[PDB]
Each structure stands twice: as structure tokens, then as C-alpha cells.
Amino acid sequence: WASGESFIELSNHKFIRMKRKLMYVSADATKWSPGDNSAKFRRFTSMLHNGLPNNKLKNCVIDALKQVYKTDFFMSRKLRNYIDSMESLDPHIKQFLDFFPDGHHGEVKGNWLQGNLNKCSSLFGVAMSLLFKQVWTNLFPELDCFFEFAHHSDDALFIYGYLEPVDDGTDWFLFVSQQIQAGHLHWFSVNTEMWKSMFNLHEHILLLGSIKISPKKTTVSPTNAEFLSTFFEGCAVSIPFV
């Protein structure tokens, strides 16, 4: 996609040249995070298409998800023994002990506590990313943008293709202003550095499904041999031999 060139169509049968550029985002989107609602999977499996003729297995999966919703967290013995002494740090320790009604076990909801739902969560993330792709394509039918991703275990790689002015002239800015004043309010976020708006919309749409791109440990870089090579090596090897 980047090799080719994009030309936009102004109303009076005119063409504006554009330069296609890419920038990649690496993130651990499907990595289990402590703040997550496992209940979001119930409607997903209610609507996901499977070749099965009936709904017995799908409904059984939904019922399992319902039962795994509420979990009884238990305080480890070492912490219980230790907490009986040195309670100088009263605020947070007091809140933590208040979480336990009887001082031995409390109720945890939503969070599924590092349970093995890797493939389910990754499939959910793929679904939400395809949703963002569809929404962005609907948003700017005129613009020739681009978006492709590929998960690997707990990682991801979102590639955003965007359009930048070639002549550095105001023709692109003039077109954007005309679109804005014509009623297309959303074009305000496209004239300068549209890839930022692409990523912001993508992250917001993911947040609509409770997925949160971590503000740390996510790197975004343009086409770079070293960045891609390190991503692919990280994909290939899981444990350092040392």
C-alpha cells in the first residue's frame, strides 16, 4: 500500500497528489490486566458465528462465563500473619483489611484473576480492531487510508497508513477547511498528523470494549528495519537462553 500513491478528488473533477506513509504501533493489548470485566465476553459469544446448528455449546459457554464472574479472593497466610504487626501504614492497610469482611476472604467481581482466557481475549481484541477499521473506513470514504494488524500471543502490531501533503501547500488545508465548513465536522482532526487521530479513535473504540492500551511499554515508530526486526525476533523467541 505504501509503495503506491493516493490522489484525492475535489468536487470540480480535480486531483490532489498525496504521499502515503506508514507508522507502526506495538502493544500488549490482550495481556491480562487486573481491571477487566469478564462479563463483556457473554454477549460476544452470544453473537459470534459458529458452524454449530444449535446453541447448546454456545449457551453452555455463556453459563460458564456467568459462573466465573464472581470469585472469592483469599488472603495468603503469610500476609495474614504479617499484618498482625506493624500497622503504622494505617490508610491503605486499613482499606485492604476492610475489603475482607471476615478477615479471611472477600468477593471479587469482573476480574477473572489471571485465568487462562488468552485465545478468547485475543479474539475479542481482533474483533474490536476490525470494528475500528470499519468505523474509520465509514468515517472518511473519500480519504485513501489504511489499517492492518496482526496479534501474536499477548502482543499486537497495528500499522496505520496515512496521507500527508506533497507540495506543503495550502491546497490540502483549503480542502480540509472546505470540508469542515460544509458540515463534515470530524475533518477537524485530519489536516495535521492524521495518524494521531487514527490511533486516538482506535484506542477509544478499544476502550469501548474495556480494552486499554497501556500508556507504558507500547512503542510507536515509522517504517524502520530495526523496529520490525526486534518485533519479529520477540515473536520468534519467548525466553532468553541466559
Binding site: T219, V220, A225
Partner: protein
């Protein structure tokens, strides 16, 4: 000199000892000795009563082997990077560094190297979330001089790595089978005077240093209270959202019109039913 102490096979016990040695080149820190007994042109330093546990004792027992293994790993990685055997100077420098890191097993250094593993790529890329990773470095107090030395090295290395992003220019390279416009930009070693060609070798150096710290201190009570409090805090946040927005709405998820009329519902631990349905449709396609 081995003072009496509780038996090391009872958990939580310590063995208390004290060393006296002739002052000379080696693992000598003058300011942390108990005293230096002067003599006739010879000074004898005597340490303080130092108590170590079984984990630290066994870690000290295999310090030489661990340092040698880490040095050989660095040797292989250097040859893979450059293509030529390193000079004896770099070899001896990294052996000294690995030996000193294997000697001093402390939790602060382990955390520091763990964060540095993810700090290096965060300053190599174009944009990233490096401020949070930097803030992670200042969570526990700096107690000894080794920690300050390692912090100073990390700060210099990170600033140097981030400075390379001011000279980014577009070139033409062939990836796979297509010639594309990439954006290129030194990579100073962490424990020598050499420069690398790929920053992945820098990351490998840092990772090798991170794994010189035994997993025993990786499971200290200070690191278990952390996960307990994390789970409890997130549960309490879920309860707060539940009581503010009603249990049914949190557990079942809001609709589109609720989000458009509120816009504060778009948050972690809250999902939009319409969004899940639409994503299921998009994947069904």
C-alpha cells in the same frame, strides 16, 4: 569469623559472620568497614557483623559461575552483532561488571534492570510512554553507592539513546521484496567502551544483567503485598463503579445512548453492549 546464630535450615534464620582481611585491591569499600586496624606498613580492615539468609548464601556461592556464564553470553551476542572477537579490555570490563552484580543481590537493582529492559525500546522508538517508565525508577529509596552508580549509568544511556532521534532522515531500503522509505537515525554499551550496531544487543546486555539476580528476592513479602493490594484496589474500584452506576449496568454493560449522554462511561471495567455486538458482527463477516 563465624558468630553463633540460628540454624539456617529453620526458615527465616540468618547466619552472622565477620571478615578480617589485608587492605588491598579487590572488593574493598573503606567507608563501610567497622574499622581499619593499622599496623607496621599494613592495614587490616574488619567488616561489621553481616547476616545473610540461605538464598543469598547460595547466590553468593555460585557468583563466579553466574558471572562467567553472563560474560560468555555477552561474548556470543557481541560476535553476533559485530562479527569479530572482542578485545580483552571489553571482556574484562564486562566480567568485572557481571561479577559485581552477581555479588550484590538486592531488590532495587533487580527492579532497576527489569524496568530498563522496557526503557531502552521506549527511547529508541519515535513516540512512546517513557515518562511512566522513568517514574518507575524512583519508587524505592536509593540506599547504597552501587545503586547510585547504576542509576547514573542508566540516565546517561537513556539520554544518549533518545538524542539519536533528532537526526532521523528518510532513506530507501529493501524489506522482504519491496523497496520502501524507512526512517533511520550511537548505541553505547552499558558495561564497556564499545559501541553496538543494533540496539537489540543493548537490550540483550540489560536482560543478561537482569537475570543475574536470583528469583528468591523476586518473591519477597514486599512483592506479594503489592499484588494483594493491586487486586484489592481494582476490586474496590469495581465496587465504586457498581454503586455509582448500579450493579446491572456494570455487569451487563451500557448502551450507545447512555454513552453519548454521559461520555464518562467510557472507562475500564465498563463495556458498551452495542460495541460488543458490532465487533461480533465485524468478526462474523
Amino acid at each position: 569469623f563465624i558468630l553463633p546464630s540460628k540454624s539456617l535450615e529453620v526458615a527465616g534464620s540468618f547466619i552472622r559472620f565477620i571478615t578480617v582481611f589485608r587492605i588491598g585491591p579487590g572488593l574493598v569499600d573503606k567507608d563501610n568497614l567497622d574499622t581499619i586496624l593499622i599496623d607496621g606498613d599494613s592495614q587490616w580492615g574488619v567488616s561489621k557483623v553481616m547476616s545473610i539468609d540461605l538464598n543469598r548464601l547460595l547466590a553468593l556461592n555460585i557468583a563466579f559461575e553466574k558471572a562467567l556464564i553472563a560474560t560468555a553470553t555477552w561474548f556470543q551476542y557481541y560476535t553476533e552483532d559485530q562479527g569479530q572477537f572482542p578485545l580483552q579490555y571489553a571482556i574484562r570490563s564486562v566480567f568485572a561488571n557481571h561479577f559485581l552484580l552477581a555479588i550484590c543481590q538486592k531488590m532495587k537493582l533487580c527492579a532497576i534492570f527489569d524496568n530498563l529492559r522496557y526503557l531502552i525500546p521506549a527511547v529508541t522508538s519515535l513516540y512512546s510512554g517513557f515518562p511512566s517508565l522513568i517514574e518507575k525508577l524512583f519508587e524505592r529509596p536509593f540506599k547504597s553507592s552501587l545503586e547510585v552508580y547504576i542509576y547514573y549509568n542508566i540516565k546517561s544511556l537513556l539520554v544518549a539513546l533518545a538524542q539519536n532521534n533528532k537526526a532521523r532522515f528518510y532513506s530507501k531500503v529493501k524489506l522482504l521484496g519491496l523497496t520502501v522509505d524507512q526512517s533511520t537515525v550511537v548505541y553505547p554499551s552499558f558495561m564497556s567502551r564499545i559501541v553496538y550496531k543494533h540496539y537489540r544487543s543493548l537490550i540483550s546486555e540489560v536482560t543478561t544483567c537482569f537475570f543475574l539476580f536470583e528469583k528468591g528476592l523476586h518473591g519477597n513479602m514486599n512483592e506479594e503485598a503489592k499484588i494483594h493490594l493491586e487486586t484489592v484496589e481494582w476490586a474496590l474500584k469495581f465496587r465504586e463503579k457498581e454503586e455509582k452506576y448500579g450493579e446491572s449496568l456494570v455487569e451487563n454493560g451500557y448502551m450507545m445512548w447512555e454513552l453519548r449522554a454521559n461520555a464518562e462511561l467510557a472507562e475500564q471495567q465498563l463495556y458498551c453492549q452495542d460495541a460488543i455486538e458490532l465487533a461480533a458482527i465485524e468478526l462474523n463477516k
